[PDB]
Amino acid sequence: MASKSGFSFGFELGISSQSDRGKHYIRRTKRFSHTKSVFLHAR
Amino acid sequence: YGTHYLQSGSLGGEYRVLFYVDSEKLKQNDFNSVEEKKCKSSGWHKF
């Protein structure tokens, strides 16, 4: 997210204001399961 | 001694084989993607 808001006016007098906003969020998830089964009966 | 005696017959050997194989394979891939944006701008002249 990025937001900007600023004011700049002349009147003598002059006034200026600027506000800067930046925000980032990131999420990752990984899950792994491996099952390997062997049965060997000989007679 | 059982129930009977052998009146006649043949002698020799029996050979039998039963052999069985059963393979199954399954592979499955599911993929999903979502992309979204907003943008906004306001100003006049100064703001």
From Swiss-Prot, chain A:
PTM entry text: N-glycosylated; contains one or two bound glycans. Not O-glycosylated.
Coiled-coil segments on the chain, per record: none
Subcellular location: Secreted; Target cell membrane
Superkingdom of origin organism: Eukaryota
Transmembrane segments: 5-11, 12-16
Function per UniProt: Component of the membrane attack complex (MAC), a multiprotein complex activated by the complement cascade, which inserts into a target cell membrane and forms a pore, leading to target cell membrane rupture and cell lysis. The MAC is initiated by proteolytic cleavage of C5 into complement C5b in response to the classical, alternative, lectin and GZMK complement pathways. The complement pathways consist in a cascade of proteins that leads to phagocytosis and breakdown of pathogens and signaling that strengthens the adaptive immune system.
Recorded family membership: Belongs to the complement C6/C7/C8/C9 family.
Connected disease: Complement component 8 deficiency, 2: A rare defect of the complement classical pathway associated with susceptibility to severe recurrent infections, predominantly by Neisseria gonorrhoeae or Neisseria meningitidis.
Subunit structure: Heterotrimer of 3 chains: alpha (C8A), beta (C8B) and gamma (C8G); the alpha and gamma chains are disulfide bonded. Component of the membrane attack complex (MAC), composed of complement C5b, C6, C7, C8A, C8B, C8G and multiple copies of the pore-forming subunit C9.
Protein name, UniProt field: Complement component C8 beta chain
Naturally occurring in which organism (per UniProt): Homo sapiens (Human)
Gene transcribed to yield this protein: C8B
Curated annotation (Swiss-Prot), chain B:
Free-text description of this protein's post-translational modifications in UniProt: C-, N- and O-glycosylated. O-glycosylated with core 1 or possibly core 8 glycans.
Domain of life from the UniProt record: Eukaryota
Subcellular locations according to the entry: Secreted; Target cell membrane
Entry's family note: Belongs to the complement C6/C7/C8/C9 family.
Function as written in the Swiss-Prot or TrEMBL entry: Component of the membrane attack complex (MAC), a multiprotein complex activated by the complement cascade, which inserts into a target cell membrane and forms a pore, leading to target cell membrane rupture and cell lysis. The MAC is initiated by proteolytic cleavage of C5 into complement C5b in response to the classical, alternative, lectin and GZMK complement pathways. The complement pathways consist in a cascade of proteins that leads to phagocytosis and breakdown of pathogens and signaling that strengthens the adaptive immune system. C7 serves as a membrane anchor.
Subunit structure: Monomer or dimer; as a C5b-7 complex it can also form multimeric rosettes. Component of the membrane attack complex (MAC), composed of complement C5b, C6, C7, C8A, C8B, C8G and multiple copies of the pore-forming subunit C9.
Record disease entry: Complement component 7 deficiency: A rare defect of the complement classical pathway associated with susceptibility to severe recurrent infections, predominantly by Neisseria gonorrhoeae or Neisseria meningitidis.
Protein name (database record): Complement component C7
